[PDB]
């Protein structure tokens, strides 16, 4: 529980992987390596209803618990790696992306550098749903 960095100026950086699907949100802090995990609070751990796992609210709760949990270990600032589902599926991030990123900045952390890391394929395998799509 002791990052031996200087009390005055030294910022200890983590990196927060915000995987935001359209029916879940993840907020997951790691080393600059990306190997050693510190926190992972999902949208679904906080709220107990299936329809609001992908909420701005649930993502706001998740980022708040992550912010509080990582402040104790002594992670001061965070780099950001945002992503939607990707592959064959959507490449627009979920509605929890904005509220989560906002929430762990309202909660007194520092924001380093942000970038999209969605798995964008060269050209991909056949997408789920028939030739005639998802008819409803």
């Amino acid at each position: 529980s002791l990052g031996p960095q200087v009390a005055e100026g030294e910022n200890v950086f983590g990196v927060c992987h915000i995987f935001a699907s359209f029916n879940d949100t993840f907020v997951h802090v790691t080393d600059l390596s990306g190997k050693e995990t510190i926190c992972r609070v999902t949208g679904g751990m906080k709220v107990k209803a299936d329809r609001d796992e992908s909420s701005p609210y649930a993502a706001m709760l998740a980022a708040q618990d992550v912010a509080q949990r990582c402040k104790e270990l002594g992670i001061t600032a965070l780099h950001i790696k945002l992503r939607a589902t990707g592959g064959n599926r959507t490449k627009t991030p979920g509605p929890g992306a904005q509220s989560a990123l906002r929430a762990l900045a309202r909660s007194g952390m520092k924001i380093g550098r942000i970038e999209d890391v969605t798995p964008i394929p060269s050209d991909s395998t056949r997408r789920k749903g028939g030739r005639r799509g998802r008819r409803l």
Binding site: Q5, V12, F13, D31, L32, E36, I38, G112, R113, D116
Partner: protein
């Protein structure tokens, strides 16, 4: 009922002598409990650092991958692994009404390291051009791509890895290709999109500690 972060030593990370800001940050490890060792489990971690943070303050769109190939003592020693342009940059460059020319060469340094370099270049629209398009014919494209490969090979092949990174810290290769292809078709947004690492020589320490000052 075991606090899992009680047994965690923090380790300072060090970048090689080629960059201005030496230390990248800190790294977590588990205390040597049993047979598996802290330093051995810590050896071979890939750190993706933006060149803005790696230097003092510059371009933030070029990133360098660095491998902790050895640990001396409370200090991870990273070494040049690879390079990649950011998604935002690559997506911003690729726009409609022009020709995108892509090359890749599999070239080896004087020491063991064998890289794969990917070059990219987009056909520039002239200052008095009224034609919307500004496309390159197929033979003009592959004459450009042949010249891309010829420079990319020459620049790396003849000198060692310390000097090829010193060339990738600016974009001397991309500026050289861009000026070279002015006669065939004027390109503008020319970079070495990506550098990959395929083979390393069998690990040395004296060769690492020359790169670490």
């Amino acid at each position: 009922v075991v606090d899992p972060f009680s047994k965690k030593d923090w380790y300072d990370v060090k970048a090689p002598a080629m960059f201005n800001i030496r230390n990248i940050g800190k790294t977590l490890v588990t205390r040597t409990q049993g047979t598996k060792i802290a330093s051995d489990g810590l050896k071979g971690r890939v750190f993706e650092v933006s060149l803005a943070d790696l230097q003092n303050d510059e371009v933030a769109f070029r990133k360098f991958k660095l491998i902790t190939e050895d640990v001396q003592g409370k200090n991870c020693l990273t070494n040049f692994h690879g390079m990649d342009l950011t998604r935002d940059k690559m997506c911003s460059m690729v726009k409609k009404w022009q020709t995108m020319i892509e090359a890749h060469v599999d070239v080896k340094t004087t020491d063991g390291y064998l890289l794969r370099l990917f070059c990219v270049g987009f056909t520039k629209k002239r200052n008095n051009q009224i034609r919307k398009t500004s496309y390159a014919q197929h033979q003009q494209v592959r004459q450009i791509r042949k010249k891309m490969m010829e420079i990319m090979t020459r620049e790396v092949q003849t000198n060692d890895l310390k000097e090829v990174v010193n060339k990738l810290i600016p974009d001397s290769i991309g500026k050289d290709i861009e000026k070279a292809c002015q006669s065939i078709y004027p390109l503008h947004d020319v970079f070495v999109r990506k550098v990959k690492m395929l083979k390393k020589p069998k690990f040395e320490l004296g060769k690492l500690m020359e790169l670490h000052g």
